[PDB]
Amino acid sequence: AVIKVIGVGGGGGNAVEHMVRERIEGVEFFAVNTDAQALRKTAVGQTIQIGSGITKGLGAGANPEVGRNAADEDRDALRAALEGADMVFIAAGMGGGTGTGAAPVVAEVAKDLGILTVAVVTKPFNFEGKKRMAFAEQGITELSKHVDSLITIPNDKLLKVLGRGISLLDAFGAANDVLKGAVQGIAELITRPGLMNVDFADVRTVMSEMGYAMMGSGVASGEDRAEEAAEMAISSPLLEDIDLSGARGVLVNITAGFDLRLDEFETVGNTIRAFASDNATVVIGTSLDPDMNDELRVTVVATGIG
């Protein structure tokens, strides 16, 4: 399956800059912005400038309306770039102008081409103030009309795992890392499959036209790695706001080396199937990281959460 990752606005561009730097195997990177100078500044894959007629390349002025109008003016360039994809991840920091307003247009264009359309977006930190949070929530509502799955990562949740005395700059770096881990934790089922390989049609089944989603991850080493990593994922602060038995779909990626035991795959799946509703679509597969020894990662995406 052909996977494209598109950063929208400045935050989404910084996130994609990080994924390009740290690398996600098997995906193709793009960046969409109204700010032409920001587009050119760093390596973010191919660049797509939107709204040059109305913004003159000078940005959206933190105004979601301008981001929307900019993307509306350039649906043709968006469609031309998206064509050929089986799946697209749209990454954006919501609460500014371009991400908030242009991301739902990018998503609408992609949905129209029949692409499986997954948004991965952040809500701002509390310290960024009430108006940015309001803009973010309105843009997420607009976005939810035009995606297959919309994964929200609230930056306020990341606050509680940040080291003390952290710099303001490293706090945003951490947001990039979580977004990168989020895309990577879904994409690697496709691009680095292990033994229990997920068919892209089953990815589509658990993600297509599901609406809101959240994800959590766990990691563990040693004899109890499977139980420990699964429970850590389900206890994740990024998942704590939802009842997992309420999700209409659950996608699980177990990342392992070549030493996965049957009883470990059994354990992870039994734990998921216990907390998931009896009528949920449940897809569990494995991915391969050969540089692991006696350890495991479990990534859980709860989809269709309402």
Binding site: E22, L158, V161, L162, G163, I166, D170, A171, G173, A174, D177, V178, K180, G181, Q184, G216, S217, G218, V219, A220, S221, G222, M232, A233, S236, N293, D294, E295
Partner: protein, 88 residues
């Protein structure tokens, strides 16, 4: 790049004390590997809690060059490990 700095802080003929910077986000545990640079032996491995910023590697041999590698295993990132060389 996590940890972002890794150094040998003290060295004896059969042991090395390594130190790294505190991480920006919670690390669940660190995986530490080490072995002779270009060796027919598999590297040896151990883990330390994610609250540590040092570890001691023992059972080494004098005058051997070693490659040491630290993986920070976090639920919140997939950052690459950091690696150094050091001769006892």
């Amino acid at each position: 790049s996590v940890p972002t700095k890794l150094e040998v802080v003290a060295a004896t003929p059969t042991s090395l004390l390594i130190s790294w910077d505190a991480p920006a986000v919670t690390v669940s545990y660190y995986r530490i590997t080490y072995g002779e640079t270009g060796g027919n032996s598999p590297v040896q491995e151990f883990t330390v809690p994610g609250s540590k910023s040092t570890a001691t590697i023992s059972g080494l041999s004098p005058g051997v060059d070693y490659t040491i590698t630290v993986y920070a295993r976090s639920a919140y990132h997939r950052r690459s490990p950091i690696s150094i060389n050091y001769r006892t």
